Amino acid sequence: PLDEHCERLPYDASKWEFPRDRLKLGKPLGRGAFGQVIEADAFGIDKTATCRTVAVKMLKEGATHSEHRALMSELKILIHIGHHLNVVNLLGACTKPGGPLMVIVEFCKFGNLSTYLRSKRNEFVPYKYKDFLTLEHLICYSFQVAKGMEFLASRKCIHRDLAARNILLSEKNVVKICDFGLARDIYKDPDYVRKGDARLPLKWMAPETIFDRVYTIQSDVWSFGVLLWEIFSLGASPYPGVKIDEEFCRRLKEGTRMRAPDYTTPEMYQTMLDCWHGEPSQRPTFSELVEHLGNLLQANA
């Protein structure tokens, strides 16, 4: 994957650099130990003379030169990856000396999908209630994330933290993959469990990642299976009531899997099980998931 050697990638300022004085910073959207994302109004960032709400990632008190380097590498990878409907897209950056490094991307009106789905439990019907979610919505979100991941894989990039908290919902039921990264407080966040000298999203991780620290596109497929469970539980937390310890990891390696969530179809639950194959090479590819979910979306209609 090209996303592990980011320091050699180009930053073309003539294309991406956006003047600080055209960016009006607003309220924080998320804050971690070293990073934060701020809502902003950017004047003319993507369309001449047009104000646009954007999301700006930058560092905060506690960050060091190390995090500054990391954020520059993030900027470089976003440029390399390029645009897709189902990934949050880069709009510009402020990199000039005298102010903080700022990475400016599309703002997504409804925010993270897990929180959103959990807000709609009382506003769901399998089939049609104007603003209700339906099975069609849930399969559609699943299909979109698969399309985004197929795209990322095509760019030789791996996500490493795929989960509903890293999927954002925009207008018109469009969902976008993101990575909040440093803007998430992984100490306070119960989704990230202490494992040695790191805080890791253990409930989303493939066995080979947990045990061998191996990250590949096919470990992303495992995480995609967990995301499917999150979608079809309407934003529930994975492995309900289970202590995430050494016994959890062993049983997982042994072949223990989550039961079907409340809103799933049989085919969608089988798709989760397929993503959770013990053998990485035997999991579906994102291209295959795109095909399959597209078929399920049609079967739903």
Ligand SMILES: N#CC1(c2cccc(C(=O)Nc3cc(Oc4ccc5nc(NC(=O)C6CC6)sc5n4)ccc3F)c2Cl)CC1
């Ligand atoms: N391409 C790519 C990938 C990649 C790698 C690394 C970083 C990113 C990335 O997402 N960067 C990034 C993220 C950011 O976080 C965002 C982006 C949009 C956004 N919209 C929000 N909406 C709300 O909160 C509404 C309820 C009120 S919050 C919000 N936060 C900001 C800046 C980034 F560069 C991304 Cl997309 C591999 C997936």
